[PDB]
Every structure is written in structure tokens, then in C-alpha cells.
Write an enzyme that holds these catalytic residues in place. Structure first.
Site, PDB file in Angstrom:
ATOM      1  N   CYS A  92       0.810  -1.212   0.000  1.00  0.00           N
ATOM      2  CA  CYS A  92       0.000   0.000   0.000  1.00  0.00           C
ATOM      3  C   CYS A  92       0.849   1.270   0.000  1.00  0.00           C
ATOM      4  O   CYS A  92       0.330   2.347  -0.293  1.00  0.00           O
ATOM      5  CB  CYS A  92      -0.950  -0.021   1.234  1.00  0.00           C
ATOM      6  SG  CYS A  92      -1.366  -1.725   1.834  1.00  0.00           S
ATOM      7  N   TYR A 187     -16.599  10.357   4.982  1.00  0.00           N
ATOM      8  CA  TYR A 187     -17.491  10.434   3.818  1.00  0.00           C
ATOM      9  C   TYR A 187     -18.080  11.839   3.651  1.00  0.00           C
ATOM     10  O   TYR A 187     -18.155  12.365   2.529  1.00  0.00           O
ATOM     11  CB  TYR A 187     -18.632   9.426   3.951  1.00  0.00           C
ATOM     12  CG  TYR A 187     -18.404   8.053   3.384  1.00  0.00           C
ATOM     13  CD1 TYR A 187     -18.656   7.772   2.037  1.00  0.00           C
ATOM     14  CD2 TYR A 187     -17.961   7.018   4.194  1.00  0.00           C
ATOM     15  CE1 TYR A 187     -18.452   6.487   1.525  1.00  0.00           C
ATOM     16  CE2 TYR A 187     -17.762   5.739   3.691  1.00  0.00           C
ATOM     17  CZ  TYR A 187     -18.012   5.481   2.363  1.00  0.00           C
ATOM     18  OH  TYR A 187     -17.814   4.213   1.884  1.00  0.00           O
ATOM     19  N   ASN A 227     -24.485   5.873   3.295  1.00  0.00           N
ATOM     20  CA  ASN A 227     -25.843   5.791   3.834  1.00  0.00           C
ATOM     21  C   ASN A 227     -25.671   5.544   5.326  1.00  0.00           C
ATOM     22  O   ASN A 227     -25.379   4.410   5.740  1.00  0.00           O
ATOM     23  CB  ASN A 227     -26.651   4.677   3.171  1.00  0.00           C
ATOM     24  CG  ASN A 227     -28.076   4.567   3.711  1.00  0.00           C
ATOM     25  OD1 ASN A 227     -28.321   4.668   4.919  1.00  0.00           O
ATOM     26  ND2 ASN A 227     -29.025   4.335   2.809  1.00  0.00           N
ATOM     27  N   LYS A 230     -27.593   2.598   7.116  1.00  0.00           N
ATOM     28  CA  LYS A 230     -27.138   1.281   6.692  1.00  0.00           C
ATOM     29  C   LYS A 230     -25.716   1.014   7.175  1.00  0.00           C
ATOM     30  O   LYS A 230     -25.383  -0.119   7.547  1.00  0.00           O
ATOM     31  CB  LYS A 230     -27.238   1.155   5.172  1.00  0.00           C
ATOM     32  CG  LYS A 230     -28.652   1.402   4.653  1.00  0.00           C
ATOM     33  CD  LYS A 230     -29.045   0.437   3.554  1.00  0.00           C
ATOM     34  CE  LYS A 230     -27.954   0.299   2.511  1.00  0.00           C
ATOM     35  NZ  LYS A 230     -27.568   1.608   1.912  1.00  0.00           N
ATOM     36  N   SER A 250     -14.219   0.458   6.248  1.00  0.00           N
ATOM     37  CA  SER A 250     -12.921   0.090   5.696  1.00  0.00           C
ATOM     38  C   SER A 250     -12.741   0.730   4.326  1.00  0.00           C
ATOM     39  O   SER A 250     -13.682   1.257   3.735  1.00  0.00           O
ATOM     40  CB  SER A 250     -12.795  -1.433   5.547  1.00  0.00           C
ATOM     41  OG  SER A 250     -12.958  -2.096   6.781  1.00  0.00           O
ATOM     42  N   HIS A 352      -9.243   3.148  -2.579  1.00  0.00           N
ATOM     43  CA  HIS A 352      -7.898   2.700  -2.201  1.00  0.00           C
ATOM     44  C   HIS A 352      -7.319   1.787  -3.279  1.00  0.00           C
ATOM     45  O   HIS A 352      -7.185   0.576  -3.082  1.00  0.00           O
ATOM     46  CB  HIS A 352      -7.966   1.995  -0.838  1.00  0.00           C
ATOM     47  CG  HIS A 352      -6.634   1.624  -0.262  1.00  0.00           C
ATOM     48  ND1 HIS A 352      -5.446   2.175  -0.693  1.00  0.00           N
ATOM     49  CD2 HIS A 352      -6.314   0.763   0.736  1.00  0.00           C
ATOM     50  CE1 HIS A 352      -4.443   1.647  -0.002  1.00  0.00           C
ATOM     51  NE2 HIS A 352      -4.946   0.795   0.880  1.00  0.00           N
ATOM     52  N   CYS A 382       0.416   3.415   5.826  1.00  0.00           N
ATOM     53  CA  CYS A 382       0.811   2.083   6.267  1.00  0.00           C
ATOM     54  C   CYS A 382       0.737   1.111   5.095  1.00  0.00           C
ATOM     55  O   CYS A 382       0.146   1.411   4.049  1.00  0.00           O
ATOM     56  CB  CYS A 382      -0.082   1.591   7.411  1.00  0.00           C
ATOM     57  SG  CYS A 382      -1.836   1.353   6.922  1.00  0.00           S
ATOM     58  N   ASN A 383       1.381  -0.047   5.255  1.00  0.00           N
ATOM     59  CA  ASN A 383       1.368  -1.046   4.189  1.00  0.00           C
ATOM     60  C   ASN A 383       1.420  -2.444   4.788  1.00  0.00           C
ATOM     61  O   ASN A 383       2.008  -2.674   5.858  1.00  0.00           O
ATOM     62  CB  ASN A 383       2.490  -0.822   3.138  1.00  0.00           C
ATOM     63  CG  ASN A 383       3.940  -1.049   3.674  1.00  0.00           C
ATOM     64  OD1 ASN A 383       4.666  -0.078   3.890  1.00  0.00           O
ATOM     65  ND2 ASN A 383       4.374  -2.312   3.804  1.00  0.00           N
ATOM     66  N   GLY A 384       0.752  -3.368   4.107  1.00  0.00           N
ATOM     67  CA  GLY A 384       0.774  -4.769   4.490  1.00  0.00           C
ATOM     68  C   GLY A 384       2.196  -5.278   4.660  1.00  0.00           C
ATOM     69  O   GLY A 384       3.077  -4.927   3.871  1.00  0.00           O
TER      70      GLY A 384
HETATM   71 CL   LIG Z   1       6.861  -3.820   5.345  1.00  0.00          CL
HETATM   72  K   LIG Z   2     -15.871   2.361   2.769  1.00  0.00           K
END
Ligand SMILES: [Cl-]
Ligand SMILES: [K+]
Ligand SMILES: [Cl-]
Ligand SMILES: [Cl-]
Ligand SMILES: [Cl-]
Ligand SMILES: [K+]
Ligand SMILES: [K+]
Ligand SMILES: [K+]
Ligand SMILES: [K+]
Ligand SMILES: [K+]
Ligand SMILES: [K+]
Ligand SMILES: [K+]
Ligand SMILES: [K+]
Ligand SMILES: [K+]
Ligand SMILES: [K+]
Ligand SMILES: [K+]
Ligand SMILES: [K+]
Lengths: 396, 395, 397, 395
Positions: A92, A187, A227, A230, A250, A352, A382-384
Site C-alpha cells: 500500500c 465520507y 448511507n 445502513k 474500511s 484505495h 501504512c502497508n501490508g
Molecule cells: Cl513492510
Molecule cells: K468504505
């Protein structure tokens, strides 16, 4: 970082961010990247595309994109065949690490004009068949979803990043409700910026020729989907019953690209270019893979120290919203008030495209500083795998 | 280049290079990469794995390897979770561009200890199904070979690299016979180096858990030379009039290679003994189907960056994507074969594409020692039109 | 009764060797195997031309990627006229025998005089399926479905393998791992003894595989030679670890092969002055609970005997298809049929089980057992996934 | 031989490809048609059915013995004998012939016979995973093309054999379009007049995730007629000069149909009221590519086996695999189109290939009832060169 040559941003540009299998799903990752590169260069009065010497471009899920995605982005944008092109994968953070590497290449004197950024077409990530070469004599076989495998699953524990986000919420005490109210707020900020025209400058609309009428994609696809009732009522996404992380709070899966154009001090003078911003410094950091959520709390101070800038001097932060809880946790650890964070909304509402987001948030940060009459900005993503990257800019 | 901080190579290491679906095909790309990183660090007296701050690792065909191949390489080698990790793709030049980026990161002061290199498991490259998400209502569909799509096919012409090799033969006038005799010579050099022990230092043997355990100590391809069969085999890409063959081309292969880089200040702080100094580097690019002769641009650029004349180089590594690639670049640059790939090249040794850029650098440092040379230059072309090159001084 | 309907004679039969999974015949498609058996059975009839064949019924279970109408491909491949009526038959494991029954009936209603019936299966060339490519699947790992497992060996109701239901049969009727292993050994030995004595030479049609330059010839069944009693009694159970009684060596294997018989009406038999090998006396299909298909022949066998007006004690030889060793053990106990009269040249556990072909395969072998052991009345019975079984009574002439 | 009576029949609506019935499997459609027809017979329990023959062509991934799943899903006893039959497009009718023979030989008194096809749920195939393919792009085979619509010998789709039929007997793109438009309007008129209501058993698709329930009662295809669009659409198999198009051909479709047959003695024992009596049948075959005109052999064969003259038939159901197929067969038998497919044909109704043999027989009885007719004949061609024909008398 002051004892090293200056690096100027002379323009930036991004595609609209399309939804998964949505408005931009017909375009490949290099088509998106070329569009962003070409639109960024068209903004620079006095710099030709043939002046660009080197390209770094982020891309994570590169399967079936073909040789060297960055090279394809550069040629598709109309750059010279002489251009040096490298694809970068830091999950990411790819799009921001690409910009760091481009700045360094100016600083070591090996280029004076660099394009850097990132692209991702998650819509066109394929599935994999891993055992066709040696064969599988008997039994059902798996078709591996490339997004899950190469984009979203931590390699160490084989855990989706959303599960590690739940770990973050438990670690730091963030409830379902705190995450949902953050998501609604971001949002609303993205909708407000959209409606006010505040993304108009940074977005380069995409023209899809009809096969049938043409279609122009102008806006980010996700923000209008808010929404609130929801969002508050939906089931958890990763842990039944007690879960706090949801699809609405997310980041989505998305398609898009973003690019910046970097020049040395010498080239800025030679061509009498108007600089938009100066790169003051950057920092990468990493920690335990399942704690990638709070790696920006290491990278951001590191970048501020590299830049010689105090945290309180920053006018606006872009903290990439991999999850709502990621923004909440880094704000808590660093003591950054939300009124300085993602002022035009963030990835939870905007989208994303993982290989592009590090460059996407920098494009948006420059728009935030201009709109809010700020001077100093910091982007952190951040990144995975446990990492994060951060960069500090000064609007000129 | 001379006005920026110095970058020292304190060690290097590579796996054996395995054949396609061969001796190393049970290992993933991060497993090969971890093995190379760990073996390189073991050679440095006074430097701990926990001292490594940042990794740049090449990898081209990354499908199904999982998140960030370089990060997996680093953690698998036993590096700290604090280590910054970036995977690099410049196709065949990935392993050398990774080392360039590592050197730059020391030069800008953002690291004092960097591991760089590359890895490739072509055996474990998958096939792709491209249209399962949106579906395809009717009609036969295709399973895309990932090696062909992301490794070996020029994107614009949609032609395999062997056809670019034929463009090279036509453009620079090298016949089937000339390519074959080049290939035989480079297999002979690789076999001689093998038998004389000259790869023993750079190679870190691989132990495969057993049946009893298997140890892979040698590169798999050099022994396959059969000169009669090589001169007689049919051409691989153009029937009848073709000049490029599987014997006179690089194979598909598995392997990894790594170097350890330190700043001048850290060298002195830890009292480390450097193997070599990086003097300069250069990337270049031209028409994508002409990538075969991009080293003729990158090598002079790296030499100029290093402030070194071409005649002062004691040994070159010009990556043998095909025999015709070495022939054409030697012709264009005026470099005699007596200074090129002195222990053989990738036509005989193998070509794990994301690793070869670092593989030839490790082999070059061995060549400089064995042949009592001081200045060396590695140059490697890459699909898409590019090349990367790097100049080192053996200390 | 049967006597109010025309007579139906078998004038010849033939079968390929049974090849192992991905083994000796894996290069041949199911219609290539079927055409080979049809051609061989017809070559054995003095006075009958391939153009005399009017209709074909041929069994085949896993027909995926075989192409349009496997039976039509078998018939045209064997050199039959394009005027031939061809229908493919799927009764899973019983397909080869039901095809023969439908062939007999088509003469008996007077719509044909010369029928070729049998079955074929190339399990080596059964594909994998991609089930959801038309509408797509937006996100998630997906499945490549093994066509053998899906269409051949899994009960549709419980969605479980037939081995696990063979395991259920063992618990139902009290047969141990040792009891199944000892049976498996005996039928492997009968198979090997039959091979060693050449008792399979007549019924088998050897297959030639073209080379560059000479030709490789597959003459023998591939599985019988694989018997290893030490390994067999010591192998891990295949379906239930630890307490399982069903194993791979005591189960039938996956196999390739085909078999065919030629049926004629009484008019053609004397019109062409043909020597009949056997007469079809009767047949019987039966079915019960799907997971209890293992004992379905215990209904079909007596039903076939009744249809044929023949007693169980009058039968000289039985072919009870060995889908699993426990299948043969249980049906012998249920019907009260001693093993001394069952699968005298071995059964599918040692010979192989190309599922669409086996119903015709055991009939071909049955005819050979009756000749060898000098009997006259035989009964073939074969169970099939889904709960069913088929059986046929023949008289050797 | 004993007499065989049809005591009922039912068919699903015929769904479009990936359309209104795409969510149902071939056995679910088949079970629906079986229990619907059995519901029409007062005095006959489903437990009285002893044997089932069901046609199904593209059986890949349907599971073990499609006919058995049809029977059990319909509520038939586990004691029922079940056999799946494949004669490609003639499967549904050949199944019925086999069921009548099973009654004629006295092995059953109550038989359910018919056919089902879910062309929507036909899979793709990966044929070489067991042995593997080391290097190269690979194919996924569309099961509809391979096992349904391709002649095995010529490896050509049925549309190319239809273009053969056009140049064989002289039928232009305008003649076929005119027939297609006529059969579409006979289908639409029957829908509006309720003439399909009795034979069609509607299907309930309940949504319970808050979604609303959906009932399919109509055939999906007949409404799609647009003559302007139809006349101007490009050819489908031969560019520019072809005469076969998608509008004038049958579609790919989902659907099922069943008949309940009983013996002479059972009709009397249970006091059942017979809908019709099977008079005779006939199968025929010729050159595989000339399957289009194979009904020209089986239809006379069935009329002669039954003892009925061609001039004595009140209505024909000649299955329109293509519009040119109906035109060609009508020419060769000398049958006036005013006695053909009086409620439309498969070009407008749909062509689930494994079911159509039973589908046209079901619709035939509705034609004989509505037109007040006595003798009906149904012929259906199938891939491979064959055809099946059946003759009924309404009672
Ligand atoms: Cl890393
Ligand atoms: K979202
Ligand atoms: Cl390039
Ligand atoms: Cl059954
Ligand atoms: Cl046919
Ligand atoms: K410009
Ligand atoms: K704009
Ligand atoms: K060390
Ligand atoms: K030391
Ligand atoms: K060593
Ligand atoms: K070679
Ligand atoms: K003969
Ligand atoms: K023989
Ligand atoms: K066995
Ligand atoms: K009823
Ligand atoms: K109705
Ligand atoms: K149509």
C-alpha cells in the site's frame, strides 16, 4: 536533508478513483497510469514530456499487466523510449516509496526530471492456477484470487489485513461506534469537497470511447455511496458478533492512478518553471507485520525529523485510511487532532487503489494545502507486512 | 558521483542457479532470496543481521508469491521486523537496479547498512485466468502463462524475447554459426570455472529436507553442453532461416543473489573489511524491441558516472540473455571477448530474470579476484528497452 | 414373460485391456477405446459384416470434453455405417450393462436385428471443470472441480465419495479391514492366475500404439501385477484414518477401458447361419437408498433370475462387480452365494474399473469363465452410485 | 406388443441463456417437470413410477446420473430405476421411446420419460491438469461448444452445417427470416391466447434476503422478436454471404419436460384417463453434417412403423434447430407449413437441447387439443447425423 539538493514538485494529477468492477474497470493499470502522467505534465508550463528522464511507478498486483508496468505507463503517456522506468512494490505504500526514490535520483544527480507515482487496477487482477506446470493428478484444485494473495493477505500469518485491523481495534480500544462515526465524518468531508469543486484541479477526467455513446468519468465513485443508517446497521466483515471492522468503515477495492512531476533546482531555473511545492523530507519505518496499522506512528516522526519540521508546524496531514481504525489509532498515538487530518476525506470514502494510494494522498494533500491556505503538509501511509512511508512537503 | 558518500560492498552471495522445473523448483522465490541474504551476511565479520536497515530486492514474476516479495526475503533471512523492504521490477535488470537504489539510499543518508539483490522462481510462476470476475458468457477462454506474459513478451509488439533476439541478429549481422560458437565458448568457460572450484566461494549450497536430504551445490545448466547437438538443433523462433536456438539462448531458471552495502562511516565504526567499492552506475533505454543493445548505452554511461575509461576495465559481465546479445554489445562497444564473462554467462549458467542483475555482480567480484583484476563493469539488458550497468573496484 | 418376446443371442464379445489411471492407455480417448472393442467383437463373428449393425447403445459416465454423443463416436470410429442409430447411456457404474439391456429390448420390440452394445471410459482424460466462468465470480478463491470426483464417484445426495459409503457398507454388514484385505488378495491371485494361464487372451483385444518407428503393444491388464500383500495389509486406510477398513488396494482403481457385445435376433442368426455364443435369458434393474448402493445387486440379482426363470443354485458362475472388496463380500453374504462361484478370474479390485465400461467388461469376462470352467448358466451383477444395480442372466451355448 | 399410453405431460417455461431460469440446475428443472406431470394424473401416486429415462446432453458438473437426481428431486421412490440418455438434440424423445419399450417388454407399468438441459450452467473444461503443461498458454474449453454444438468429425458448429443445409436445398437469408418471423408470431399469439398455460408448470423462485418472490410463467424468448432488428442483423456464421443468423436460429436455453407413460393393463387397473397413445416411432441417421435433413428419414420411418400415412397427420412438430431446418424438411417430405409448429417452434420458443425432444411432444398434444386434431407427429434432428420421430393419437 537540508545539506542535500532541493527537489521541487512542479505538478501532480490523479485519475478519478473507480469502484471495484465499476466506472474504470475497462482500463488496465498502465492505461490509468499513463493518463495520470500525461495529465500531470500538461500542467507544467515550459516542461515537455520529452524532458522526463526517469520514472518510478508503484503497482502491487502486477499479474497479467505484462512486462514492467511502469514502463508501460511511461510509454502510454507519450514519454521518450529513452526514459528509465522501474516498477515499485511496497504494497500500500508503493506510490509514495516511488516518489521517494524519484526524489533521491534527483538528489544523487542521476536525473533532473522525474515522474513518480503509482497505479492499480484491482478490477483486472486475475486469478491464478498454481500447479498446471507439474500437474495435479487427482482432486479439486484452487483458483487463487490475486487480490487476496498478493494484495490483502499478510504473508507471515496468512491473515487478511482486515483481521489485523480488528487486532488494532482491540489493542487500542476503538469500538464499532467510534470507527463508524469516523467513517461517516470522512465520507461527509469527501462529499463536501466533491460538491465544492475541491477535487476539480487534481482530477483529470477520463473519456471512455463508446464501442455506443462515449462516457466521461469525472468524479470519484465511492463518496456518494454513504448511507449512515445502513452503515451503522451492517454486520461486521471479519469477526462475527463482536467484530468492529465493516466494509463501509474500511477502504474499498478500487482502480486509479496518480503522478507527480519532480525537478532539480538547476532544471527549475533553466526552464523558468513555477514550483508547486518542495519536498522537505521523508521516512520509512516498519514493525511487527500484524501491527502495520500503527507503523505510520513511526514513519511520520521519522519524516518530520528528516525534514527538520516539528509536528505542531504541520498544517494538514494525510493519514491513509486503510481502515477507519488506522486513522483513529495513529491520531491517538501521535496526538494529532482530527481537524488536521484528511481534510477533504480519505480512502474509506474516496477509494484505495493500493499501488496508487501513496501518490494519490500526496496529490490530495497539495489540494488541501492550497484550499485551506496551508504551508506544511505530511502524508503517511501504512502497508501490508508491517511497514509505513511518510513524506513532508512545503507549498510554495 | 565522487562528490557523494562512498558505498562499500562488504559481501555477496548467490544460490546455485536451478533449471526450469529442476533442482530448486520446490523452493519459492522468497525462500531462495532469504537463503542468499543470510549467506551474504554470514560472510561479514563484525556486522550482524540486526544491523541491516533496508532491503531492495528484485523480482519480476511476482504473481502468487504473496505480499512484498522483498519483505518475505528479509524476514525469512532473519532480519529485524524494523527493516524497510521494497520489491523492484525492471524486468531482467531488477537485481542490479535494486543494488543501485540501495547505494543511493546510503548516499542520501537514509541508511548505513543495506542489503540488495534479486530473486526469481520461474518454476513456480503460475498461469492466469483473466476474466473470472466479470465472466465470459460463451466461447473458449485462455489460461495465460505468467512467464510469457510478465517475463518474456514485449508489451507493444506482443512478441517473445527470442524474436527480439532475431532482430538483434539481423540488425548487427550475426549468423547462426557465430551465435553457436559463442554459446559453446561460454559453456566451456562455465564448466572450466565449475571444475576449478571458482564458484565455490560465491555459491551458498542449498539443503533440501529429505528419503534422505539432497544438497544442491552446482549450477544445473553448464553440464548440459553437447556441441554436436547444439550445432544441429532446429532454430527455436523462426523455422528454417532462424539463428536463435534454445542452446544458444539463456534458459528459464530459479535462483537468487544478494550484496551487503555499507556507508564509509559505518565501515569505520564497525571495523569492517570491504570487498569492493561502487564507483558508479548507469541506466539507459531505447526502442523496446531493441532492448538487446541497450547495454551499449548503459555501459558508457556507468563508466562516465564512475569516472573510469572503458580500456581500464579488467573484466566485464555482459548478461547473456542470448548469445547474440553478447556478440552485438561487444561489437558496438569494441570490447574483446577475452575480457567478457570470464567464468561463463547466463547462456550456460542460467537466467532467473529478477536475480540475474545481482547474480552477475557476485560472479564479477569472483572474476576480478581470480584474474587479478581491479575494475569491473556489469551490464544487463531488460525487456521493455532498458539496460542497467554498474562499475566496481575490487579492494 | 420373456418367452412371449423374441429371442436375443450374443454372437461375440471383446474388450480392451484395462489400463491404469494415467497409465498404459492414457493416450486414447473414450471413443477410441470403444471403437477398438466394437471392431474386435465384430471381427469375431463369421458371417456378419459391420454394415449389418443397425443400432448401438454404449455406456459412458464422465462424458465431459469427449464431444457430441460418445456412442456415435465409438460406432463411426469402429467402421459402422453412418446409418447407425447411436445412443449413449449413463447409469453410472451400471452403464455398460444397461446399454446391453436396452440393446436386447430394441431387438425384442422388433426395431432392430443386429445391435452392438457395451461401454467405455477414459478416466485418465476426464477433465477439471470451471463452473462459474459465464456469470463470473467477483471476489474470492474459486474451485477447479475434478470431473471424476463430481460426475463419477460422489453421491449427489450426501455429496460424499463412494468410498465413504463403502466404509458405511462395512459397518452395516460386519466386514473388517482384514476381511476386505484377504478378499482383495484372493481376487488379485485369481486375476494373476487367469493371466498366467492365458484365460484372458481370447476376450482381450490387444492395443497397438503408433511409434515414430516400431509400435508399443498393450496386451495385458495393468493392475493385476501390482499386488503386494506386505504393502496391502500395511497401507493406511483411504477414507477414515485409523479406524477405516476401506483402502486403495482393496478398492477398485481408476481405469481406462472398453468392452462390447454383438446381439442378433433369431431371424438373423439363422438367416446368416451364425454360431451363437450365448442366449440372454433375463435381466433386472433395482435401486434403493443411494448410500446403500453397495448392496443393490442383492435386489437386482434375484430379480434377474426371476425374469429368466432360473434358480440361484443353477448358476454356474457369478460376476459381482468389485467396486470395493466389501461390495463383493456383502452381496455374497446377503444372497448366500459362496465365493467359490464368484469372479473366478478375478474382479475389478485387481482388474480395474473403467466405470462406464465395467458392466460390459464383467459380462465379457463371465462368458470366458463359463467356457473355461465348463458351465452353462451365468449371472452378472453390478452396483452403481446413486443406489442402483443391474443384473443379467446368460446361457452359454 | 402391449399398448403404451400417455396419461399426462408437463414442461417448464423455456428460459433464455443466462436468463430467468439460469439459477436452477438441470436436475432441478427436470424434477419440476416430472412432479408437475404426475400431479395431473388423479389416481396415480408418484410411488407408482418404477423407471425413469431422462435425456441430458451437457452433463459435466451436473453430478452422478442426472436422471436419478431428476427422479429423487421429484419425489419418486428410491426404488426407481433411472437412466440418463444422450442422443444430443434427440435425447428427450429417444428417452421416451426407451420408456415405451420398457413397458412393451413388460419390465415396467409406469415410466416417466423426458429430458432436461441447463445450458446456462454448462461449465468450462481444463483438460490437461492431470499431466500438466510445462510452458505455454492453455485453453479452457466451453462445454456447450464441445459437447453440444460441435460435430465431432468436422469440428464445425451446427450453424455451419445449417449453412450447408441452406446451399443444399436453396433457402435464402430472406426465406429463413420470413419463417423465423412467422414462427415468432405463432408463438406470441399462443402466449396471448393462453394456449401454453396448461402444459407449462410455472416455476417459483423465492427470495428471502428481503428480496421479492419471482414466478416464471412465460417462455422467455418469444417476446424478443423485433422484425426491423431481425432483418438487418449481420450473418452469424458466414460473413456477408451467410444465411443463418442468431434471430433465425434457435437460442441456447434452459428447460425440461416429462411425460408419464403407463401400460394397457395399468390404465385399466387404476382407472386412468389417457391423454394419448403412442402409435410408433423411428430413428434414422446419415452423414453427420447432413443431420439437418435426417428427420426426412425418421419421420417416414415412424409413420410406417405406426401404420399411419403422411396425409393423415393433423399437426407436425418439426424441431427448428434452425429456421432452414424446418424449411428443408418440409420441402423433402412435402408438408405444408400450415400444419407445422402451430404454436411456434424452437427458433422462437427456445432449444434446451436435452429437453427439446420432450418439449415439442408436450407442445404437440396442446396443438392437437387446441386445433381439435387426432394424429400428431414430432421429428427432431440431432448432432452427429441422426434424428428421432414419434407418432401419437390424441384420445
Ligand atoms: Cl513492510
Ligand atoms: K468504505
Ligand atoms: Cl525499460
Ligand atoms: Cl440409481
Ligand atoms: Cl446421430
Ligand atoms: K507541459
Ligand atoms: K483537472
Ligand atoms: K555476520
Ligand atoms: K570487525
Ligand atoms: K560459499
Ligand atoms: K542455453
Ligand atoms: K466379421
Ligand atoms: K483375442
Ligand atoms: K485395488
Ligand atoms: K397424482
Ligand atoms: K399448468
Ligand atoms: K431466435
Amino acid at each position: 536533508m537540508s545539506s542535500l539538493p532541493a527537489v521541487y514538485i512542479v505538478s501532480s494529477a490523479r485519475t478519478p478513483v473507480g469502484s471495484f468492477l465499476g466506472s474504470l474497470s475497462s482500463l488496465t493499470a498502465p492505461q490509468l497510469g499513463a493518463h495520470a502522467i500525461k495529465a500531470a505534465l500538461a500542467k507544467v508550463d515550459g516542461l515537455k514530456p520529452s524532458d522526463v528522464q526517469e520514472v518510478f511507478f508503484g503497482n502491487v498486483i502486477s499479474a497479467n499487466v505484462g512486462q514492467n508496468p511502469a514502463r508501460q505507463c511511461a510509454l502510454g503517456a507519450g514519454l521518450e523510449e529513452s526514459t528509465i522506468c522501474t516498477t515499485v512494490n511496497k504494497v500500500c505504500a508503493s506510490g509514495l516509496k516511488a516518489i521517494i526514490l524519484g526524489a533521491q535520483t534527483i538528489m544523487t544527480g542521476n536525473a533532473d526530471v522525474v515522474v513518480a507515482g503509482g497505479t492499480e487496477s484491482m478490477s483486472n487482477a486475475p486469478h491464478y492456477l498454481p500447479n498446471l506446470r507439474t500437474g495435479a493428478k487427482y482432486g479439486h484444485q484452487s483458483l487463487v484470487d490475486g487480490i487476496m494473495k498478493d494484495g490483502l493477505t499478510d504473508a507471515g500469518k496468512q491473515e487478511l489485513m482486515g483481521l489485523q485491523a480488528e487486532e488494532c481495534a482491540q489493542d487500542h480500544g476503538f469500538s464499532r461506534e467510534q470507527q463508524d462515526e469516523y467513517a461517516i465524518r470522512t465520507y461527509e468531508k469527501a462529499q463536501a469537497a466533491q460538491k465544492a469543486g475541491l477535487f476539480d484541479e487534481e482530477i483529470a477526467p477520463i473519456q471512455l470511447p463508446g464501442f455506443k455513446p462515449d462516457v466521461t468519468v469525472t468524479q470519484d465513485e465511492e463518496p456518494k455511496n454513504l448511507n449512515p443508517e445502513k452503515l451503522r446497521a451492517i454486520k461486521p466483515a471479519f469477526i462475527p458478533g463482536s467484530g468492529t471492522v465493516t466494509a463501509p468503515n474500511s477502504s474499498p477495492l478500487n482502480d486509479g492512478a496518480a503522478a507527480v512531476v519532480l525537478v532539480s533546482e538547476a532544471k527549475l531555473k533553466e526552464l523558468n518553471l513555477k514550483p508547486v511545492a518542495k519536498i522537505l523530507g521523508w521516512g520509512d519505518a516498519a514493525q511487527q507485520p500484524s501491527k502495520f496499522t500503527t507503523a505510520p506512528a513511526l514513519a511520520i516522526p521519522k519524516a518530520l525529523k528528516h525534514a527538520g519540521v516539528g509536528q505542531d508546524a504541520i498544517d494538514a496531514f494525510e493519514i491513509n485510511e486503510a481502515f477507519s481504525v488506522v486513522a483513529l489509532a495513529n491520531m491517538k498515538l501521535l496526538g494529532i487532532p482530527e481537524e488536521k487530518v484528511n481534510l477533504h476525506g480519505g480512502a474509506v470514502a474516496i477509494g484505495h487503489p493500493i499501488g496508487a494510494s501513496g501518490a494519490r494522498i500526496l496529490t490530495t494533500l497539495l489540494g488541501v494545502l492550497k484550499a485551506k491556505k496551508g504551508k506544511l503538509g505530511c502524508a503517511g501511509i501504512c502497508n501490508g507486512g508491517g511497514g509505513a512511508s511518510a513524506l513532508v512537503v512545503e507549498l510554495l
